[PDB]
Design a protein that fits this description.
Distance between the termini of chain D: 70 Å
Structural class of chain G: mainly alpha
Largest interface: C-D, 40 and 27 residues
Organism (chain F): Leishmania major
Chains: A mainly alpha (about 100), B little secondary structure (about 55), C alpha/beta (about 140), D mainly alpha (about 210), E alpha+beta (about 200), G mainly alpha (about 100)
Shape of chain G: elongated
Family (chain F): Belongs to the universal ribosomal protein uL4 family.
Shape of chain D: flat
Protein name (chain F): Putative ribosomal protein L1a
Distance between the termini of chain G: 22 Å
Largest sheet of chain G: none
Helix content of chain D: 25-40%
Function (chain G): Component of the ribosome.
Bound molecules: potassium ion, magnesium ion
Number of strands of chain D: 3
Radius of gyration of chain G: 20 Å
Strand order of the largest sheet of chain D: 2-3
Structural class of chain D: mainly alpha
Order of helices and strands of chain D: EHEHEHHHHHHH
Family (chain G): Belongs to the eukaryotic ribosomal protein eL8 family.
Number of helices of chain D: 9
Oligomer: part of a larger assembly
Strand content of chain D: under 5%
Radius of gyration of chain D: 28 Å
Strand content of chain G: under 5%
Number of strands of chain G: 0
Chain lengths: ~100, ~55, ~140, ~210, ~200, ~55, ~100
RNA sequence: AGACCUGAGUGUGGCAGGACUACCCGCCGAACUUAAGCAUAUUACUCAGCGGAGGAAAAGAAAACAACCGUGAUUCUCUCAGUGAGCGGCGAGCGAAGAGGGAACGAACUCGUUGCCGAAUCGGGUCUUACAAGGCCUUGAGUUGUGGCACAAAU
RNA sequence: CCAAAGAAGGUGUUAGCCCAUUGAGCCAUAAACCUGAGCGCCUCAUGAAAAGCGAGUAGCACUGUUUGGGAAUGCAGUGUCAAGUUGGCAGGUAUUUGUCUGCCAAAGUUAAAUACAGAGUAGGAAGACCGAUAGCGAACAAGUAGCGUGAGCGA
């Protein structure tokens, strides 16, 4: 399954030629598998507790229509751009479910 | 490493009409102000004390 | 040995070769490499040019293993070919096979005239080395 | 008078020297022969204690990493569960048998696994397993004669059963083929190197067209 | 299980209900002592994660520490020597408040073994940690393989030597490899490795 | 086979498989009186080799 | 004493601040008559004691438990998640 | 009446306290000195100070290396390497990490969690020669969860 | 005349044979340690024959410190603070996208290699070291006599 090597020290598939084995299944492969029960527990808890002040601010930003400002606010509060994208997506989904 | 130096010896300075070698502090004994720490002093440390390295 | 030093010869000389005038004082010029730009400038300038300043890009996490690339010339290939292997070797016949990476070399260089023709297995090769080794009746085989 | 010397960088400005005011920071090796003798004595006492078991447990063969050492071979930490399975052994039982087990090392190629499985086959063929109760021998255990035969492996690397690490054999002297005469090796290697060296800029110039 | 719901609720620390609960608890803890013995932990899930069991010989104490940076204890804010070392207010303690609370609890009650600690509440003036402690003389502790180790004499006052989780945190033992090469096994050990002058016998 | 020679004062024992220069040349002066057994004597070609082997 | 004042003031401060619905729902409780009936029904189906279980396991030694209410946070939560619970009773003063 | 929760007072059974502190662990922490001056830097993450343990301590079982044909907990040794790394009034000076040869190594386990059970748990009495990893008895703790089974060396 | 003993101490001068010593071996033995995980009895144990995994945490910001770690190596205070449905961390030049490799933090226990740089207990082996102003301050009723209010100093 893995691409065989060319036997050359240079090139696209450089390296000594061995009969490569495929990646074996690992117990860590479940970390990238959907967690439905964790999602259900988190939804129940989120419904129980309400919204964060950060979540309220982002939802007002999204209702007003300043998505870029919501993303900037999330980036400053969370510190990373990926987390800001995820939080803004969560708040948009919350608004759609309303 | 402590063989000539286990004293609180200090020089008396000039103006006392004695050599500026450090001397044993305190009184009441025969070593009081007796000169110390030097390879030329009676109970002092040898020159370039030998090492195990 | 202590009996061969100048100290033994200078017993009774009262100065041990440091003079009556200048004398032997603790640090008359500073300590170590002090003053390389002040009062030691001439020494540094004429004996160690290029000592001060910056030059080139930085390589933060330098690893010597990826950079490993020792070289051997064509006229030194007999060091890897055995005696009876070298004796029985000519163009068009059975040639000794030299494995460079097993012998500790990565690239084959083309300096000099190859003495005994052979088949060389090398990771790298210069163009002149490849051309010469083919002209001599040997060959270069790439390897990783 | 300083003259033409190397610029000194002797690196001895800390209180390394033991003196009247400093404990120092040194490490002498005056105990080296005594420690070597102690180590050999301890290895002999351990061998006598664990008799007849070999003093060193069985280790696999691995390939040294990086392009500087990938042509070299040495003993690894322990046999992978894949190699142990291919040799017909349960890893937990193999640990009790005297085989080191490493669950971290993955087999990225067939050759390494085959080498280590051959090591395991040879070891299990040479293995003499003593019975738990010599009045009731089970399947796979030794007999009275084999137990009496005993004998212990005291090799430095625990390699009497399986030998030293095996390197690939040298290629026999050969004749250059017509292709090897014709082909320009430098051009081939250089173009393969350039394919990766300029890959990004070639792909960027592939766009805008 | 119920643990998932408790853990998810405790991940929502800024929600309105959790802020209300923490407000009430913080007021209560403000009007209590610096060290308080608790019958049961405030967060059973966190305590059991950190090693607390509902067994005889397991104790929970809540410890209060004051917040803010460390002020250097020099008279009238007067330092000497190089201006590099002239700071009085801006310096920070190189040990976290969790380790400080663990060490306070340990030095107060020397008959107990500190196991772990967790954050329970925070305030503008104080932070509270609940410290898990174990009685080494309790038969239940001494005959239980899980916690049997802490009876051994090498674990006396392990919070004072930085062996707890917070101590490991402020020692840099959370990292391995190239992030902690000069930190392992300790700074002192690596400094001895890198600074002792080696004299080989033949050289 | 050294049992009878250990206690003889003035007779030093040696093993041909480990010859010591400190005993072959005491004080740095070559020319020590050496007594060879035939079996040890015959191993000198193997141990030290020849000019060609 | 300090603890008496603290418990009284804690009740006062819980009454005085704005209590979110998640916590305020526990203030509103079931009616007293219905509470008595539920407690009676649970009392009838109380779990076996140590002595009762010991006697039953001694009786079975010459060769499960009778129907009872599920108790304990873990087991009750598992019953709820798997929807085996017909009715769940929750205390209003858990701390 | 009583119960629970939160706190007391006594009885009973225990532990802590000080010493040592050469090495080891945590914090705190200088200056002389060098830079031919000196403030960053250096001395030095050292001395002094405070606290803690052992026969060793600490570390240790990959949120590790690497970029290989791949390696495989920790610790230590030689080398890497006084380094064509790097940090530095880029000055004085500092300055490591992979890999490789080795020492050692039966080296691996335990909780929490998640599923399935649900007191099967733990202390006390008392009897087995027995403060049994045993049997009986005990609301005494414990269901605001003790314990058992499975989780990649597994099936 | 001994020597499987020549071993270096003592005895009135320089001792293999004056003495002690210098071996094989014998006697005794609380437990602990080692031996078909030594070998019996009672008792007690015991082998095989779908979900999700550590949250004021990790990150960011500012400030301090530390590091060779350099648009920030680790840590600390405060702020505010996650993800897990396509997850997270690391991959030594900051950012936004992709693609690849390893690995799965925020709970815990673990021997051996290593230190003993002014420790201690019971024993040993010594030395191209010093030889009474030397060597430990101390070969002696030495941390003694003596001095100082005292910390201490100290023959
Ligand atoms: K100041
Ligand atoms: K400075
Ligand atoms: K002898
Ligand atoms: K911080
Ligand atoms: Mg002296
Ligand atoms: Mg004269
Ligand atoms: Mg001269
Ligand atoms: Mg001069
Ligand atoms: Mg430049
Ligand atoms: Mg002193
Ligand atoms: Mg058996
Ligand atoms: Mg290292
Ligand atoms: Mg103490
Ligand atoms: Mg100095
Ligand atoms: Mg200066
Ligand atoms: Mg000067
Ligand atoms: Mg000055
Ligand atoms: Mg420093
Ligand atoms: Mg100190
Ligand atoms: Mg001690
Ligand atoms: Mg330890
Ligand atoms: Mg490793
Ligand atoms: Mg080098
Ligand atoms: Mg070099
Ligand atoms: Mg430094
Ligand atoms: Mg190695
Ligand atoms: Mg449990
Ligand atoms: Mg004599
Ligand atoms: Mg047995
Ligand atoms: Mg995790
Ligand atoms: Mg945080
Ligand atoms: Mg610094
Ligand atoms: Mg540990
Ligand atoms: Mg000692
Ligand atoms: Mg004297
Ligand atoms: Mg004296």
């Amino acid at each position: 399954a893995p691409t065989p090597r060319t036997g050359i020290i240079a090139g696209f598939n450089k390296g000594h030629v061995t009969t490569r084995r495929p990646r074996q299944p690992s117990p860590n492969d479940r970390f990238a598998v959907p967690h439905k029960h964790l999602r259900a527990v988190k939804a129940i808890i989120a419904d129980l507790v309400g919204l964060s002040p950060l979540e309220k601010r982002v939802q007002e930003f999204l209702r007003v229509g300043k998505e870029k400002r919501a993303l900037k606010y999330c980036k400053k509060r969370l510190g990373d751009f990926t987390a800001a994208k995820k939080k803004r997506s969560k708040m948009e989904e919350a608004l759609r479910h309303a | 490493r402590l063989s000539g130096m286990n004293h609180s010896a200090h020089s008396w300075g000039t103006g006392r009409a004695v050599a500026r070698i450090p001397r044993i502090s305190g009184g009441g004994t025969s070593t009081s102000g007796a000169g110390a720490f030097g390879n030329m002093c009676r109970g002092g440390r040898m020159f370039a004390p030998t090492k195990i390295f | 040995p202590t009996r061969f030093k100048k100290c033994r010869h200078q017993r009774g000389s009262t100065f041990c070769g440091y003079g009556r005038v200048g004398k032997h004082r603790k640090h008359e010029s500073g300590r170590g490499n002090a003053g390389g730009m002040h009062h030691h400038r001439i020494n540094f300038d004429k004996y160690h040019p290029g000592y001060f300043g910056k030059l080139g890009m930085d390589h933060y996490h330098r690893k010597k293993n990826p950079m490993w690339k020792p070289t051997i010339n064509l006229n030194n290939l007999s060091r890897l070919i055995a005696a009876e292997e070298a004796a029985k070797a000519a163009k068009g016949g059975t040639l000794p096979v030299v494995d460079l990476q097993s012998s500790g070399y990565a690239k084959l260089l083309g300096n000099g005239h190859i003495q005994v023709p052979c088949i060389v297995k090398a990771r790298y090769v210069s163009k002149l080395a490849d051309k010469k080794i083919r002209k001599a009746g040997g060959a270069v085989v790439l390897q990783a | 008078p300083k003259g033409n010397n190397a610029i000194p960088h002797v690196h001895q400005k800390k209180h390394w020297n033991p003196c009247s005011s400093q404990k120092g920071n040194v490490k002498v090796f005056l105990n080296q022969p005594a420690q070597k003798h102690r180590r050999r004595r301890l290895r002999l006492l351990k061998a006598k204690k664990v008799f007849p078991r070999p003093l060193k447990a069985l280790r696999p063969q691995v390939n040294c990493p990086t392009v500087r050492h990938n042509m070299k071979r040495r003993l690894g930490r322990g046999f992978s569960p894949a190699e142990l399975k291919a040799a017909g052994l349960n890893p937990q039982y193999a640990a009790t048998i005297g085989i080191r087990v490493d669950s971290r090392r993955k087999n990225k190629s067939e050759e390494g696994m085959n080498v280590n499985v051959q090591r395991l086959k040879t070891y299990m063929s040479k293995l003499v397993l003593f019975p738990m109760n010599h009045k009731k021998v089970q399947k796979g255990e030794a007999s009275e004669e084999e137990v009496k035969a005993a004998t212990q492996d005291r090799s430095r690397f625990g390699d009497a059963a399986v030998g030293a690490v095996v390197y690939p054999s040298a290629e026999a002297p050969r004749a250059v083929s017509a292709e090897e005469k014709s082909m320009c090796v430098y051009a081939f290697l250089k173009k393969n190197h350039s394919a990766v060296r300029f890959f990004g800029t070639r792909s960027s110039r592939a766009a805008r067209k | 299980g119920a643990f998932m719901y408790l853990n998810e609720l405790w991940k929502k620390k800024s929600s309105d209900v959790m802020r209300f609960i923490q407000r009430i608890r913080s007021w209560e803890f403000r009007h209590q002592h610096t060290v308080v013995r608790l019958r049961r932990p405030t967060r059973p899930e966190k305590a059991r994660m950190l090693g607390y069991k509902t067994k005889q010989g397991f104790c929970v104490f809540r410890v209060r520490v004051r917040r803010g940076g460390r002020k250097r204890p020099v008279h009238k804010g007067i330092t000497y020597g190089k201006p590099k070392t002239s700071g009085v207010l801006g310096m920070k303690l190189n040990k976290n408040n969790q380790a400080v609370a663990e060490q306070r609890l340990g030095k107060r009650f020397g008959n107990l073994r500190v196991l772990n600690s967790y954050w329970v509440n925070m305030d503008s003036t104080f932070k509270w940690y609940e410290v898990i402690a174990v009685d080494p003389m309790c038969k239940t502790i001494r005959r239980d393989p899980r916690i049997n180790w802490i009876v051994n004499s090498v674990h006396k006052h392990r919070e004072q030597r930085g062996l707890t989780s917070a101590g490991r945190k402020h020692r840099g033992l959370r990292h391995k490899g190239h992030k902690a090469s000069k930190l392992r096994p300790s700074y002192r050990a690596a400094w001895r490795r890198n600074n002792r002058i080696v004299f080989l016998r033949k050289r | 086979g050294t049992r009878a020679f250990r206690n003889i004062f003035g007779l030093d024992l040696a093993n041909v498989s480990a010859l010591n220069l400190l005993h072959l040349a005491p004080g740095g002066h070559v020319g020590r009186f050496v007594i060879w057994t035939q079996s040890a004597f015959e191993q000198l070609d193997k141990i030290f080799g020849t000019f060609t082997e | 004493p300090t603890f008496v004042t603290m418990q009284r003031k804690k009740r006062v401060l819980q009454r005085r601040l704005k209590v979110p619905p998640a916590l305020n729902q526990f203030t509103k409780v079931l009616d007293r008559a219905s509470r008595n009936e539920a407690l009676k029904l649970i009392k009838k189906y109380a779990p076996e004691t140590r002595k009762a279980r010991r006697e039953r396991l001694q009786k079975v030694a010459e060769e499960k438990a009778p129907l009872a209410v599920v108790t304990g946070l873990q087991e009750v939560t598992r019953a709820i998640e798997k929807k085996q619970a017909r009715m769940v009773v929750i205390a209003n003063n858990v701390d």
